[PDB]
Write a protein that binds this ligand. Sequence first.
Ligand SMILES: CC(C)CCC[C@@H](C)[C@H]1CC[C@H]2[C@@H]3CC=C4C[C@@H](O)CC[C@]4(C)[C@H]3CC[C@]12C
Ligand SMILES: CC(C)CCC[C@@H](C)[C@H]1CC[C@H]2[C@@H]3CC=C4C[C@@H](O)CC[C@]4(C)[C@H]3CC[C@]12C
Ligand SMILES: CC(C)CCC[C@@H](C)[C@H]1CC[C@H]2[C@@H]3CC=C4C[C@@H](O)CC[C@]4(C)[C@H]3CC[C@]12C
Ligand SMILES: CCCCCCCC/C=C/CCCCCCCC(=O)OCC(O)CO
Ligand SMILES: CCCCCCCC/C=C\CCCCCCCC(=O)OCC(O)CO
Ligand SMILES: Cc1cc(-c2nnc(N)nc2-c2ccc(F)cc2)cc(Cl)n1
Ligand SMILES: CCCCCCCC/C=C\CCCCCCCC(=O)O
Ligand SMILES: CCCCCCCC/C=C\CCCCCCCC(=O)O
Ligand code: NA
Length: 388
Amino acid sequence: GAPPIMGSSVYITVELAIAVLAILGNVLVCWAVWLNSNLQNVTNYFVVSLAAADILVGVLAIPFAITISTGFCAACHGCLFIACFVLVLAQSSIFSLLAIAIDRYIAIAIPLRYNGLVTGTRAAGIIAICWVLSFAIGLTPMLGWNNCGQPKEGKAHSQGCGEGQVACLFEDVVPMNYMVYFNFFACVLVPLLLMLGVYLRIFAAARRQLADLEDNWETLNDNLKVIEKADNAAQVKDALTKMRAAALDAQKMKDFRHGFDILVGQIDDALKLANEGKVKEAQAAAEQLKTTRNAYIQKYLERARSTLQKEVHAAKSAAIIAGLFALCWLPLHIINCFTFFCPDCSHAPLWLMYLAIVLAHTNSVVNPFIYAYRIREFRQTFRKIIRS
Ligand SMILES: CC(C)CCC[C@@H](C)[C@H]1CC[C@H]2[C@@H]3CC=C4C[C@@H](O)CC[C@]4(C)[C@H]3CC[C@]12C
Ligand SMILES: CC(C)CCC[C@@H](C)[C@H]1CC[C@H]2[C@@H]3CC=C4C[C@@H](O)CC[C@]4(C)[C@H]3CC[C@]12C
Ligand SMILES: CC(C)CCC[C@@H](C)[C@H]1CC[C@H]2[C@@H]3CC=C4C[C@@H](O)CC[C@]4(C)[C@H]3CC[C@]12C
Ligand SMILES: CCCCCCCC/C=C/CCCCCCCC(=O)OCC(O)CO
Ligand SMILES: CCCCCCCC/C=C\CCCCCCCC(=O)OCC(O)CO
Ligand SMILES: Cc1cc(-c2nnc(N)nc2-c2ccc(F)cc2)cc(Cl)n1
Ligand SMILES: CCCCCCCC/C=C\CCCCCCCC(=O)O
Ligand SMILES: CCCCCCCC/C=C\CCCCCCCC(=O)O
Ligand code: NA
């Protein structure tokens, strides 16, 4: 049995390196949002809340984790707090991630009423509520759901602990049924699955709207060919009526409105000629629609397409951060499931526990890099902060 301080040294050194990185990177995130007005929106307010949680991981949770690794003597409820505080930060992260997903869904599903529904004031209140709920959920063991009533007295005595004191170890004070059923299944897995559902609805909404834009564009060009090859005024009329409906459907801001004002008007002119039985005159009038199409309508099509592709890209960036949270925290939770559900299985080795802990902590480092590589406004703001 090699000296415990050696393996501890590696684990502690790595934890400290992660702490420094988690603090520096996320302070940079908060600083960027503070300085740049272009980054000051509801979505990034939840980003800041998420960054704040990761800063507290470096400042508090990792020092707590280092202290716990020693198994030092402590009052059981004191040990409980140290042990549970990371649950608060993880829970807060989950709420922030869920809020970001919902915010992006609202932005893509109902953009016309997004600004009136999703404000900074309401977002601030939501963030406040979610932090309170995170403390409630994370510190639930301090409300009585703990193992302090049945301390490991043999372990405490061997370490020379005083009366009322226990060897401070996570699994000795935090019940595994809490960790598996309440924390993991209810408070982590269900919100993550809800998140997945939201992002599925986001991407499906994007795909449908991009399809609708193309269908309108196709309806516009197809009916133009119909009018040109028509032989009677009735055929011209039917094609124009479908165009007028498609034009108004695509219409649903000054150069934009004027472009469609021309289009609908030109359709009405051709429609009037069509209802008079003047086929040739109707077709010639309908030919003018191509000029409006190339000068105005096509420009609106590409810009609308460009805006949706940007929303898709932004939603993907947010989903990546959500996925990374899951990837980093799932090993710890899975290990707890094995410990809990399979008492006939040997406990996961200490080195693997340390690795799972380090991995969870690394998640507090990765987000600033995702923002830098995927979000131009962040990356450019980061450069300005660092250079100056
Ligand atoms: C505002 C921020 C910076 C304050 C941080 C306060 C932290 C460091 C304090 C608050 C409560 C404290 C714990 C309260 C009770 C005990 C029981 C004792 O037997 C060992 C120490 C221990 C486990 C303390 C460790 C440090 C602790 C977690
Ligand atoms: C989320 C992604 C990365 C998947 C994570 C899978 C990891 C967490 C899984 C895969 C295989 C698993 C191990 C398979 C077998 C055992 C032996 C048992 O006596 C204790 C648990 C232990 C040691 C498991 C711990 C968790 C484990 C390491
Ligand atoms: C987010 C997605 C991946 C769902 C999470 C899957 C989790 C809940 C699954 C994946 C693998 C599962 C484990 C696989 C094998 C065993 C060994 C058995 O003796 C007891 C149950 C136990 C320990 C399972 C518990 C639940 C488990 C950890
Ligand atoms: C916009 C900024 C957001 C900032 C807003 C953040 C507010 C966080 C404070 C929570 C205190 C309430 C937590 C309640 C959970 C109770 C469990 C508990 O405290 O028990 C410990 C104990 O004394 C057993 O001895
Ligand atoms: C600028 C940011 C603000 C600063 C944020 C604060 C940083 C907290 C640091 C360490 C927490 C570790 C505390 C635990 C130390 C306990 C060891 C101990 O108590 O040992 C006595 C004992 O009874 C065993 O015998
Ligand atoms: C101080 C500490 C303890 C644990 C820990 N140590 N042992 C066991 N069995 N589970 C957990 C743990 C697992 C999932 C979770 F969300 C929080 C803590 C994990 C982290 Cl990141 N920090
Ligand atoms: C920016 C402020 C951050 C605060 C710095 C914290 C750094 C210290 C890290 C870990 C302290 C661990 C204390 C070890 C517990 C005592 C071991 C024992 O009693 O056997
Ligand atoms: C750990 C379980 C937590 C228990 C939750 C029950 C208490 C919180 C319930 C609802 C929080 C809703 C916050 C609403 C604030 C009012 C906003 C307003 O006045 O406009
Ligand atoms: Na986090």
